[PDB]
Amino acid sequence: NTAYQGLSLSVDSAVKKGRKEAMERELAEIERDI
Amino acid sequence: MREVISIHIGQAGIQVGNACWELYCLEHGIQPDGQMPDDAFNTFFSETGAGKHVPRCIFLDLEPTVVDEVRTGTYRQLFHPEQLISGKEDAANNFARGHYTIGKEIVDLALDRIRKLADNCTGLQGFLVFNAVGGGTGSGLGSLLLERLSVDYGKKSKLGFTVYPSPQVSTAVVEPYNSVLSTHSLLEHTDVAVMLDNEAIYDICRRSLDIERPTYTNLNRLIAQVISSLTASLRFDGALNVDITEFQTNLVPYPRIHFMLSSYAPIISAEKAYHEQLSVAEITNAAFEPASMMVKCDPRHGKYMACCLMYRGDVVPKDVNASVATIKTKRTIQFVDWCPTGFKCGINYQPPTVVPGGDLAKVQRAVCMISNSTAIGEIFSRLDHKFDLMYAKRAFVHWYVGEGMEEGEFSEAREDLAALEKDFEEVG
Amino acid sequence: MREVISIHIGQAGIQVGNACWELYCLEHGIQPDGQMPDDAFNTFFSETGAGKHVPRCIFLDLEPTVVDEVRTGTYRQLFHPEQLISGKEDAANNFARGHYTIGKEIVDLALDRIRKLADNCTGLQGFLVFNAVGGGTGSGLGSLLLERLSVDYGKKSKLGFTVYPSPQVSTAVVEPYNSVLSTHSLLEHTDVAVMLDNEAIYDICRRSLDIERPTYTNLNRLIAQVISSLTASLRFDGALNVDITEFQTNLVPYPRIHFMLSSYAPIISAEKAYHEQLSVAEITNAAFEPASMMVKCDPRHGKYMACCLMYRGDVVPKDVNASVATIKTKRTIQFVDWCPTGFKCGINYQPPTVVPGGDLAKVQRAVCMISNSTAIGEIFSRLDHKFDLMYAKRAFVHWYVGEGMEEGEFSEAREDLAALEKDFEEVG
Amino acid sequence: MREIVHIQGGQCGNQIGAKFWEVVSDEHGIDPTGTYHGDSDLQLERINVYFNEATGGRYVPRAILMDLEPGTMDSVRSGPYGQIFRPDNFVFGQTGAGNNWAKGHYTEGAELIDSVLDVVRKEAESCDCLQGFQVCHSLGGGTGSGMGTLLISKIREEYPDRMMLTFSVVPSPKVSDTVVEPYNATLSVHQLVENADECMVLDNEALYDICFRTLKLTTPTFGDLNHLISAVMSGITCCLRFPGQLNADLRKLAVNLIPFPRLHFFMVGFTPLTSRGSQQYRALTVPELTQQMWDAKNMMCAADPRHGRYLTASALFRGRMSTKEVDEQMLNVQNKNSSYFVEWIPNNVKSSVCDIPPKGLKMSATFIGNSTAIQEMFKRVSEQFTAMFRRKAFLHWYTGEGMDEMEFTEAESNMNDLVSEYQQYQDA
Amino acid sequence: MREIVHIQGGQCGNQIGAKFWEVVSDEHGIDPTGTYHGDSDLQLERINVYFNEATGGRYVPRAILMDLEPGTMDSVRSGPYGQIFRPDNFVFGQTGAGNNWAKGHYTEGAELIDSVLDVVRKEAESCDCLQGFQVCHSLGGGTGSGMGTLLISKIREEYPDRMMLTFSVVPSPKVSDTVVEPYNATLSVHQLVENADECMVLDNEALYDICFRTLKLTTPTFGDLNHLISAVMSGITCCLRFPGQLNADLRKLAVNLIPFPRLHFFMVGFTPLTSRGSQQYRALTVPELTQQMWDAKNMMCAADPRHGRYLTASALFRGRMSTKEVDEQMLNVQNKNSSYFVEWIPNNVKSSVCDIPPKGLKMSATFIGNSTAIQEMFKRVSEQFTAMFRRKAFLHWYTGEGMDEMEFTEAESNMNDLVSEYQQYQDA
């Protein structure tokens, strides 16, 4: 979560979009786990 | 977000381009195979779908020999072959050949790459041209581009690092012609124009670096260091960050006066660095020394309309406030009346890197300076004199009128070099 | 359900068909021996009583020398020999021999094969002709065949991928004659008719993939790729599925105007894929580039009466929603007043599949563009010119009047092109 | 009692309906097997409104799925929540729609209505007290518009006293995913004014911004667009399902919103809405939900509320709260922006409230407003229609199905008479 | 009650606020998580002045961070207390500021204002009793000067009754870290006078002195100077946050310090300031803190109070003490140097006091002063403005954004009128 809120502020590149969506999926996974 | 497009025209432009694009891929850990083992490189690269980092540059030439060197050099895995542009014949030190005849068939190609290289950016700071005035491609073609650029964007900023025909040392014989013809058609298009020369950096290699074997690779190394310093504020943190927009507005008072000088310090080998502590004052003192300049122009015959100092490494801003104060107090340094101000200082926490097998040393401090001094009108007078000294005899003219030119542009470009020159004294 | 009957007349027709029926059996995993180790192939196959998958196509020709190659090539286990129709003698580049003398005796045979093939398909989307205008078979026979089709179906849709006699590169001397005669007949019969050309595809292999030895086997792989991206929604899922009925109501404003250009992107080799990212904005830009067309027409000489896009691979519909907006901002591209609408889009989650030994590389995105633009009335106008340039001499006419034709057809074929050329102006 | 039968026309309506039946299946906590696995009884007291009982304690939705080209109906059956539909609740035909409103409403519509009516009757007779219908259109395509309106006029003359909703997805004013889109718009509206009671309008564009700015979504797939529509569609019937200190039947929403029988085009929005970052900081109070709902962005149809005045409006809360705040919030908003409403209506909002929140949230809302803003949308379409109908483009398709031209003129006269109504009660 | 909303414009404003929101955050004992972890209920009573309640018992600062070129806002977010800011409380534009006050206030300002106003109003209503505004400017740069004043004008016309503070950092009289400094200095001054109520002026030079001599710092970095500004900014509102036997709202500071609606430029200083060594010798007594606060060194403005005349003054003490001491001290000094004070005000000081000390200390103080000596600041700026305007240097930039020359003339006159005011009441 702290990485996801530190990575933010103007996702501009394709790699940025991909990494942020990866963070979204990781978050969903761990929310299902806990 | 903060991305620049670097162009390298002529032979010299793509020569230093080899150094700069060696420094950068070294400074950011980029391997020659595209890939590295956030925004730290976005200014100079474009990460692909996965892994590779492609440099956002453009190598242009008409001589096939040199662009074919980077095609076989170790850095062929970096540049997309859409970037490397060549041509069957060359310009051969004729302006018309680069400008009128040969240029027009390939500009539609180069511009087709920029439209394919600009749309990749959402925040485009400004173009970054590397010229070499005195030849056919550099002067002739490069001028033909900026016109195609300014009609396209205009609102964008055009910056240029053009080496200049030295007064004494001259490898060409006809360069006064195309140089003068270059200056005319670039002026109303370029927004700012830096200038440098080999002979000065030759001395710079002699006095400080103390090398008796200066080849083109060394000079190209120094230009890599200077530009690596300028862009640090675009690609690194640090106190008093600077961007191109801020840079150009507080440095160009009038639309015409934009021709500027440069300097770098420290310029020291491995040994004397060990016998040195590199106080911020010493570095900013040498930076204003007229000998440490990269042009054979004497600023002590004019007044600094403005200055811009970019430091590097370990600096604290009071020392800058302290050192610049010590300089504004001296007497050899002159200024024009209407600007009691005139300094734009910047710092970066990122030290300067050194290239393995290179010539400089590992230092924790570094300073570069760019001044717009009206004393620059002097070297513009020598070339004002060589033109008429030869245009009277009409020597070499048959080439130009034989390649789709006329006598008019000889006259046309002539007056603007007088119209510019009188303007360099109206500011007094 | 959703199946298509793919015909191949002439030599080029069955040449390209040797590539389409290559990509398909690879796209769906069908081995060369009829069987793989639903609705994913039924559109292009018909599972037999056990195991084999026969391709629902017809290879028709009068020259025995090329159909007998498939009869012996690695692709004989796929085709039931009753499909591959042949003939003792050919048309020999005469429209009359293809339409009046020889073709009249084998249509009733092929008409039975279609009848034996249309019945197996429950929901017939439409036919898919592969004509090659410029020969005797493709022109004389194909034209004769479509008459026999519209009198049976009429309401059913007849497509067409007809190569066209190129302006500059031409490998025949009378193809201005037959081409005119074919259009005068197909026009009132077909309802949509794609056009494409060789030299426009020769350049694409030179400009983009940079192969200095293009061969008819290279062009055929590109025509193969065009169709796969077209028929994806017919056999795959994904947003905005597009069907042939849904493909033509919104693309042929007037009954006469149905000739349309084509395009495709990205078209690059393996290496130029590793220095790229290929955003949805890149592909939609190159797609609209007049250089990426496969016809030698200048779209910037007219406007777009309508357009269409069939994306492929991983796409989200907002960038298409956004990138099409960006194109609707530029001024180079025009649109007629009465069409403020005009972008029928389409997505498929199935990427484009690469054929081994092929020249293209693997990608996750692809865009096939199809546009009915009024600029095409120029390549229409060339053939308007060469025909009268020769018919003034009555050259080669003795063949045509000797083979069951007369001068009446030439005059009546002439007027229709004129009447169709005013039509492309009545839209302005 | 109060049961509601659900209809899903077109492809999109079939696709957004997949989510709507996936959300409410989770709200009431039933499994993809159709078996209940919730915990409370509130999941069961009013389950009979959306479902029909089955043997073995299974629940199947009282849904209808009508669409030509049965390809897409296999997708929803393949998805996670396809196994809950009675396979008898599937009407389809092989032939595609072709975006031709005529064949969707004249030829092929006439061939399935006799079947669909046999299915809607079969579960309209499965309700102890059927409240009303609700459909999911797509005013662009041929199925949703063509078949949808044809089905509607059939129901209205058979269940006059009941109420017919319509969750139509309108075309876009800027982007155009079909070409004949204005024709399908105007020809459908000419059926909705006389044969509907509440007709919400919703667009993809405003739904892209809502997904981009607020949710900070990178790539909104159609699932997410359909996801939001699912949320709103559930929000309307919280009172019919769950308890509430102030309940709101649909029949009372219509009478609280439609002063004149023709002004039944609404405008909707959902609240709360936030990303994963801001969710960590935003606090859930009635103030937040009422300022975000009254905002001009959340209006999922592409219209500016400011260019009109809300004739009436409505708000539906759900979650434990204090009913006083919701009483005064809409009292303040009605008092601050007294220009955004009319005078002949003293209090022009209704404040419903439910007692049970959504699944994972704790508070929520839903906004509905019969604002005079929507008149812009119909203004736009009535231009594109009168543009091409002035040139009779594409009109040969529609005259191919026995249609005439008066039918267009009457349909156009119907929209102008409608947009004139939104101006009378818009006194600037 | 007494909630305070905070703004941070420009780079420096985005930077000093990082400290101001770091010092305060520890005073009230909250962690960078936003969760409170102090000890006393006193931190919780008046916590609502600088923060907002968040889910899970978290507190986020009621701050707004506006700056073009979002590169800097990444730093603070990566800072130790960057996780507390609401990411929707960040507004930025990719284009650089350019420090052309016009584009900062005419073109690029206009693009973001509508967004900013949506953010201020979003949290203006989050206050039960909004006390006032406060900003963090930078007159040299174009972000704070351009946008901030542009925002200020927008705030005032929608919040006329509330009070606008300003912690603007003033350009230096000796050093100029930029060149166009006096231009944007004046054009901001021409906007502050009419749309501000209390405007402190602080300068890095005196900040360097206070850091150099008194605190005996070896290397004042930007954090330390910002660490100082954080302290004063925290001392101002100690009454609004903590108990006090003589509390002091801001509005009572206003009336007690500006006699005329135009003499509203103040001068500040903090106390005690001791290095580590002297701290073990010095003793904390009320006499100590008042002579130090009254010295002409602690004045962070680059002006000498001995050259002007204190119209009014004020002091804020924090720490348990005896209120008689502070009563007689200000009476002593008011007697002794009775030449530095005015006559027509009998008593020109306000001695407030707080019951709660700083975090680690036990006593402290803070001085505010409205002396006419500050008119020396604006006279220095005038000579720099008129000199370059006498030559129209750097001016094409400003006219390059639709500006004219009148705005330069008026802004000059208004400051000229202002310095004249500070002379009348300065009767020497």
Ligand SMILES: CC(=O)O[C@H]1C(=O)[C@@]2(C)[C@H]([C@H](OC(=O)c3ccccc3)[C@]3(O)C[C@H](OC(=O)[C@H](O)[C@@H](NC(=O)c4ccccc4)c4ccccc4)C(C)=C1C3(C)C)[C@]1(OC(C)=O)CO[C@@H]1C[C@@H]2O
């Ligand atoms: C821990 C937590 O609070 O996580 C939330 C969450 O953070 C947010 C961001 C959720 C989340 O939603 C999204 O991220 C989202 C993405 C695209 C499109 C729509 C939503 C959430 O998925 C949505 C989900 O909400 C629900 O489950 C609702 O009850 C909602 N459910 C569904 O729509 C649904 C249906 C089938 C399968 C899964 C979800 C609902 C709405 C109307 C009527 C009935 C139910 C929850 C609580 C969350 C997550 C998981 C992050 C939000 O969505 C809803 C509708 O609640 C997005 O805006 C809200 C605000 C929520 O705070």
Ligand SMILES: CC(=O)O[C@H]1C(=O)[C@@]2(C)[C@H]([C@H](OC(=O)c3ccccc3)[C@]3(O)C[C@H](OC(=O)[C@H](O)[C@@H](NC(=O)c4ccccc4)c4ccccc4)C(C)=C1C3(C)C)[C@]1(OC(C)=O)CO[C@@H]1C[C@@H]2O
């Ligand atoms: C053991 C002890 O007493 O050490 C002191 C200390 O010796 C001195 C030197 C402190 C110290 O301050 C500095 O070192 C300093 C450095 C650069 C610029 C300014 C200060 C101290 O850091 C500062 C710190 O002061 C505070 O905690 C204040 O409450 C202050 N807090 C902060 O500045 C702060 C903010 C975030 C994180 C940590 C500290 C404050 C100021 C204004 C409004 C509210 C709070 C304290 C008492 C001390 C140390 C640690 C040495 C001094 O500062 C303050 C603000 O008290 C500097 O001169 C004073 C006098 C103190 O005696």
Ligand SMILES: Nc1nc2c(ncn2[C@@H]2O[C@H](COP(=O)(O)OP(=O)(O)OP(=O)(O)O)[C@@H](O)[C@H]2O)c(=O)[nH]1
């Ligand atoms: N500092 C530096 N100068 C170089 C270098 N290489 C070439 N130059 C200078 O470039 C000048 C010649 O410029 P050219 O590139 O040959 O001229 P042109 O415009 O390209 O026209 P053509 O020669 O016909 O291609 C000479 O004065 C060189 O000294 C280099 O590597 N470093």
Ligand SMILES: Nc1nc2c(ncn2[C@@H]2O[C@H](COP(=O)(O)OP(=O)(O)OP(=O)(O)O)[C@@H](O)[C@H]2O)c(=O)[nH]1
């Ligand atoms: N794109 C493409 N064009 C081809 C190919 N082969 C032939 N063509 C062109 O098709 C035209 C002639 O095709 P044919 O099928 O041989 O002519 P025909 O219709 O059979 O008439 P006859 O030769 O008299 O039997 C010429 O323009 C060829 O250049 C191919 O493989 N690919």
Ligand SMILES: Nc1nc2c(ncn2[C@@H]2O[C@H](COP(=O)(O)OP(=O)(O)O)[C@@H](O)[C@H]2O)c(=O)[nH]1
């Ligand atoms: N929210 C959403 N809208 C869609 C989706 N698919 C299509 N739409 C829109 O619905 C319209 C197409 O209607 P469609 O049902 O496919 O044609 P029809 O079968 O003749 O009714 C177009 O405007 C599409 O953009 C989807 O999956 N989700």
Ligand SMILES: Nc1nc2c(ncn2[C@@H]2O[C@H](COP(=O)(O)OP(=O)(O)O)[C@@H](O)[C@H]2O)c(=O)[nH]1
């Ligand atoms: N106390 C303090 N002053 C700073 C700091 N950084 C910059 N300043 C001043 O801020 C001025 C530049 O203004 P800036 O905001 O960067 O340009 P703008 O974006 O156009 O407004 C310079 O004159 C600096 O002296 C800092 O970190 N601390």
Ligand SMILES: [Mg+2]
């Ligand atoms: Mg050269």
Ligand SMILES: [Mg+2]
């Ligand atoms: Mg042939």
